[PDB]
């Protein structure tokens, strides 16, 4: 499969104008996948897809604050 | 207690040309005047505050 692409494709789970959760979900999925693969001595490249997608869709400010929070221990999502 | 609404009915139905808010006696009048005074005074104080806040205050 390809970890190289054009842009986040259409996702039937988020078919409407409000794409807020698309960014959010893909951002979570990544860090959740990053943990497992980086913890159980596995392959972190499986998680690449999600990072591309969330990177494409998420505003820089959101990604920055969420990262600052994951480091601070105050990230509200469950990772 | 004792049923005294009949005396009251009498006091209030007395054709003394007084409006219902004053018909009860002399305390109605003081209450009334106290009320009107706090309202007018408070309203004047209120206008003043508006006058104060409307100007840049440092």
């Amino acid at each position: 499969k390809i970890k190289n692409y054009q842009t986040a494709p259409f996702d039937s789970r988020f078919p409407n104008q409000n794409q807020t959760r698309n960014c959010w979900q893909n951002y979570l999925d990544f860090h959740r996948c990053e943990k497992a693969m980086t913890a159980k001595g596995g392959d972190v490249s499986v998680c690449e897809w999600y990072r591309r997608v969330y990177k494409s869709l998420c505003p820089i400010s959101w990604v920055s604050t969420w990262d600052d929070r994951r480091a601070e221990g105050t990230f509200p999502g469950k990772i | 207690f004792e049923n005294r609404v009949a005396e009251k009915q009498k006091l209030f139905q007395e054709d003394n040309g007084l409006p219902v808010h004053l018909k009860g006696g002399a305390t109605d009048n003081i209450l009334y005047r106290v009320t009107m005074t706090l309202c007018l005074g408070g309203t004047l104080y209120s206008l003043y505050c508006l006058g104060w806040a409307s100007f840049p205050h440092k």
């Binding site: - | 049923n3 609404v5 009949a6 009915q9 139905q13």
Partner: protein
């Protein structure tokens, strides 16, 4: 177990409330709380319109399901007729003699 203690209207009602109450049990309606029943409305059996003065506004609903009431002053004197249907109305005095 009941012990009473609360007044009844008959014993405590006052003013106009008492007046419409007493008048009500005697079959009268000095305060126009009820709708007057029509007579035949002919020149000979006019609708008798009570009044405490010498004129009263009459509203005539000419026909059962009419949406417009026809209004007019009925004066003391001869039976007057509704401008629209000719029904007759005649003023009569009220409980309080003018």
């Amino acid at each position: 177990a009941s012990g009473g203690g609360v007044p009844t209207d008959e014993e405590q009602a006052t003013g106009l409330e008492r007046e419409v109450m007493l008048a009500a049990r005697k079959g009268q309606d000095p305060y126009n709380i009820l709708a007057p029943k029509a007579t035949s409305g002919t020149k000979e059996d006019p609708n008798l319109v009570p009044s405490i003065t010498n004129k009263r506004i009459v509203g005539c609903i000419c026909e059962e399901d009419n949406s417009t009431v026809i209004w007019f002053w009925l004066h003391k004197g001869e039976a007057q007729r509704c401008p629209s249907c000719g029904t007759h109305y005649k003023l009569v005095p009220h409980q309080l003699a003018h």
